[PDB]
Design an enzyme around this catalytic site. Structure first.
Site, PDB file in Angstrom:
ATOM      1  N   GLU A   1      -2.128 -18.121  11.369  1.00  0.00           N
ATOM      2  CA  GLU A   1      -1.369 -17.121  12.117  1.00  0.00           C
ATOM      3  C   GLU A   1      -0.060 -16.780  11.395  1.00  0.00           C
ATOM      4  O   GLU A   1       0.787 -16.075  11.950  1.00  0.00           O
ATOM      5  CB  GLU A   1      -1.054 -17.629  13.532  1.00  0.00           C
TER       6      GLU A   1
ATOM      7  N   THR B   1      -3.173 -10.339   7.295  1.00  0.00           N
ATOM      8  CA  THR B   1      -2.500  -9.063   7.514  1.00  0.00           C
ATOM      9  C   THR B   1      -1.935  -8.560   6.187  1.00  0.00           C
ATOM     10  O   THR B   1      -2.011  -7.380   5.866  1.00  0.00           O
ATOM     11  CB  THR B   1      -1.447  -9.168   8.627  1.00  0.00           C
TER      12      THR B   1
ATOM     13  N   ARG C   1      -8.550 -10.380  14.072  1.00  0.00           N
ATOM     14  CA  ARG C   1      -9.016 -11.531  13.339  1.00  0.00           C
ATOM     15  C   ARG C   1     -10.401 -11.251  12.747  1.00  0.00           C
ATOM     16  O   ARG C   1     -11.363 -10.972  13.467  1.00  0.00           O
ATOM     17  CB  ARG C   1      -9.114 -12.764  14.238  1.00  0.00           C
TER      18      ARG C   1
ATOM     19  N   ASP D   1      -7.207 -15.999  -0.470  1.00  0.00           N
ATOM     20  CA  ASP D   1      -6.809 -16.620   0.787  1.00  0.00           C
ATOM     21  C   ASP D   1      -7.889 -17.640   1.135  1.00  0.00           C
ATOM     22  O   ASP D   1      -9.054 -17.214   1.266  1.00  0.00           O
ATOM     23  CB  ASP D   1      -6.640 -15.537   1.850  1.00  0.00           C
TER      24      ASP D   1
ATOM     25  N   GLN E   1     -11.369 -21.584   5.145  1.00  0.00           N
ATOM     26  CA  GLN E   1     -12.176 -22.732   4.802  1.00  0.00           C
ATOM     27  C   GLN E   1     -11.797 -23.949   5.649  1.00  0.00           C
ATOM     28  O   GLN E   1     -10.621 -24.259   5.803  1.00  0.00           O
ATOM     29  CB  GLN E   1     -12.092 -23.034   3.300  1.00  0.00           C
TER      30      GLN E   1
END
Ligand code: GDP
Lengths: 340, 58, 328
Positions: A38, A43, A172, A194, A198
């Site tokens: 988060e 983004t 998401r 990113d 995982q």
């Protein structure tokens, strides 16, 4: 022999292709995004596609539609769970049944947003008990875009709904494998990576990332008033900072440039008016209700670590395309200066 | 539920016929001995029989 | 879980009742293999970043290698000719495999996908379903492939339909490696739960579980007669396990080697066990007597993979230094 000769030529043609690909590979820079969930990683990637990539067509937007439905369900499921956790009562008796309906949704199989589910969502959202729970979101985990989607539920439920760019930026996208987004800028290929999706043992793949060009570490400024009850009430910022320290001290990231993004600066502006930093970091000596003093303090705390390494820090709002345009222009210059 | 599942798994693992290590070891040793001559890494072959030394390839 | 104690104990006691002598005891009288001194016969140059995996073709001549340079390369080892170079969608590759037929290769990694390529070169299937990284894959034939994953599962896939025919569940940690039995009826896996498991391919059940002293198993390989296998682990130790006696027979280790093992293979007779190490060397062990017989020192970074040809004539090493070497 003719066949032998042809196999030699085929090999040399492959060598040519591998040389050409090698030349191109030397014009690639890997930017590894790190930071807790988060914090803004996904983004930021989407903003790079808007700013420097193909953006989002109407057909692209349609690919995100079910994911927006899924975000609504996940957000309401989190609040339903928190009503139990925090022992908050629902005002409306139907909401026992509405909550059960929503609680049992299989989020991964959601492809539609049918009327009885929309109605349940809206009735739950207006329940004063759910509103109390929402107001206490500091105490659990709720998406920072939950209120956004629930506020816009009617638009999202309308026949023909097509996600907006903002909807896409906030949604998401579920994956448990690696995320790579490459883009071209000034004859360089930036490969954004990113690994946040995982869920496997990092020990078994962290060496895939030896000597990446740059680490881009994201921390949510708005988590300053949240604690980890299971970790002896560790402040969430302290946990992010400990992760950061592990990263900047890792032997194979010593040649990597380190960029720190203190993100969600907008949410800090909102929260600081009612949740006091000094309550969580008593060393804080600035005024209350002052976002500038708060974010400066958080920056200084974050880079107070015990290397002559420069940490290139920026405040960001990753949902603001203009902001990311501005900040990434400076970051790109840092990275190119260091690597050329 | 998962406990019952593990008990069945352990039941299955336990109810097998085992041989003596002495026999298992004898069998491995005999296999090695029976195939020693065919192993080029153990008993190196002549340069003329080694494709990685033959001038016709490299 | 009282019943689950009574069974765990029953297994321990049964194994002890079979332990009438040790392998080393049994092999004490046989001659040592002496010093194994292999030389580099080929250096395969062309990858431009770390190599993570390699697999020989069944003709003991062609081989495939996979690198973080985003390429699979198929090489003719005899000539060093490159036969194919396949650009990958995902450069984050951890495994590759050569189909026995020679008609296909496979690979995958942090994309959680096992991609199949038809050499007779485009991607012909992406096998999706794992929820963590693809650590290892091996074809049974052109229609079926088995995979191991970071998601703690292995699977058997129908390549044509792209579905998992069988999912092999039981490991509680990331599965790192697998090896098919010579006849393909069984396979073994090694995981970060520090266990190796024997599976029936067609029934889909775990038949037997072996423990490796609480260290991650990174590599696993069948003994040539299919009645035993070896593991290589983070704790610098290789281990030999026997299926019919259902227990470990031997460990291979020296106190002055403390680094991880990435890879293991037997020589054709089973007498030698070769293993690749983080310290940039391959160590060659006497499988029967446990003595170190020799070393392959030809790389400037980790030996990440190795393989012995079906005809037993060569060993390949692959490395983080970007090179493969062929030795004998
Ligand atoms: N208001 C606000 N929302 C943000 C900001 N950055 C990210 N978000 C949103 O917060 C949520 C979590 O961010 P995300 O980028 O998914 O984080 P990740 O888990 O690191 O990928 C998403 O709905 C984002 O759009 C920001 O600066 N301000």
């Amino acid at each position: 022999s003719a066949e032998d000769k042809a196999a030699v030529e085929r090999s040399k043609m492959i060598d040519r292709n591998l040389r050409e690909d090698g030349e191109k590979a030397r014009r690639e820079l890997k930017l590894l995004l790190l930071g807790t969930g988060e914090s803004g990683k996904s983004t930021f990637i989407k903003q790079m596609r808007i700013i420097h990539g193909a953006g989002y067509s109407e057909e692209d937007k349609r690919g995100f539609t079910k994911l927006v439905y899924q975000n609504i369900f996940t957000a309401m499921q989190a609040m339903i769970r928190a009503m139990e956790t925090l022992k908050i009562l629902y005002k409306y008796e139907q909401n026992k049944a509405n909550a059960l309906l929503i609680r049992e949704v299989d989020v991964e199989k959601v492809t539609t947003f049918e009327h009885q589910y929309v109605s349940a969502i809206k009735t739950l959202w207006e329940d004063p008990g759910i509103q109390e729970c929402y107001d206490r979101r500091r105490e659990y985990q709720l998406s920072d875009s939950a209120k956004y989607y629930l506020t816009d539920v009617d638009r999202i439920a309308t026949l023909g709904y097509l996600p907006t760019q903002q909807d896409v930026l906030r949604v998401r996208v579920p994956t448990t494998g690696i995320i790579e987004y490459p883009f071209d800028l000034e004859n360089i290929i930036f490969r954004m990576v990113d690994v946040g999706g995982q869920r496997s043992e990092r020990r078994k793949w962290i060496h895939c990332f030896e000597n990446v060009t740059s680490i881009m570490f994201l921390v949510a400024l708005s988590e300053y008033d949240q604690v980890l009850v299971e970790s002896d009430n560790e402040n969430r910022m302290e946990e992010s900072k400990a992760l950061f320290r592990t990263i900047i001290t890792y032997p194979w990231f010593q040649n990597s440039s380190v960029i720190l993004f203190l993100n969600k600066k907008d949410l800090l502006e909102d929260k600081i008016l009612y949740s006091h930093l000094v309550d969580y970091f008593p060393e804080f000596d600035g005024p209350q209700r002052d976002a500038q003093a708060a974010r400066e303090f958080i920056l200084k705390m974050f880079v107070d670590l015990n290397s002559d390494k420069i940490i290139y820090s920026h405040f960001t709002c990753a949902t603001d395309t203009e902001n990311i345009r501005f900040v990434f222009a400076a970051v790109k210059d840092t990275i190119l200066q260091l690597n050329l | 539920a998962q406990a019952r599942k593990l008990v069945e798994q352990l039941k299955m693992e336990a109810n097998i016929d085992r041989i003596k290590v002495s026999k298992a070891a004898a069998d491995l040793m005999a296999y090695c001995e029976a195939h020693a001559k065919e192993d080029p890494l153990l008993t190196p072959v002549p340069a003329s029989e080694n494709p990685f030394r033959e001038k016709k390839f490299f | 879980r009282q019943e689950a104690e009574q069974l765990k104990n029953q297994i321990r006691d049964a194994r002890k009742a079979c332990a009438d002598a040790t392998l080393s005891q049994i092999t004490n009288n046989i001659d040592p293999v002496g010093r194994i001194q292999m030389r580099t016969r080929r250096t395969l140059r062309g990858h431009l970043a770390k190599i993570y995996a390699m697999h020989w073709g069944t003709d003991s001549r062609l081989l495939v290698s996979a690198s973080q340079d985003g390429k699979l390369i198929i090489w003719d080892s005899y000539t060093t000719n490159k036969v194919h170079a396949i650009p990958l969608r995902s450069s984050w590759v951890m495994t590759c495999a050569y189909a026995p037929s020679g008609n296909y290769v496979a690979c995958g990694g942090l994309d959680n996908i096992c991609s199949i390529y038809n050499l007779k070169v485009r991607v012909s299937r992406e096998l999706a379903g794992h929820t963590g990284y693809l650590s290892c894959c091996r074809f049974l034939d052109d229609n079926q492939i088995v995979t191991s994953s970071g998601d703690t599962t292995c699977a058997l896939w129908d390549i044509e339909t792209g579905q998992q025919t069988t999912t092999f569940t039981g490991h509680t940690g990331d599965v790192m490696s697998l090896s098919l039995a010579p006849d393909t009826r069984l396979f073994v896996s090694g995981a970060c739960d520090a266990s190796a498991k024997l599976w029936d391919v067609r029934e889909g059940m775990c038949r037997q579980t072996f423990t490796g002293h609480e260290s991650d198993i990174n590599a696993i390989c069948f003994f040539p007669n299919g009645n035993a296998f070896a593991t290589g682990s983070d704790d610098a130790t290789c281990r030999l396990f026997d299926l019919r006696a259902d227990q470990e027979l031997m460990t291979y280790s020296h106190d002055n080697i403390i680094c991880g093992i990435t890879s293991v293979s037997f020589s054709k007779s089973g007498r030698l066990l070769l293993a690749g190490y983080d310290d940039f060397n391959c160590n060659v062990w006497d499988a029967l007597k446990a003595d170190r017989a020799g070393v392959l020192a030809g790389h400037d970074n980790r030996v990440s993979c190795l393989g012995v040809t079906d005809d037993g004539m060569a060993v390949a090493t692959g490395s983080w230094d970007s090179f493969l070497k062929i030795w004998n």
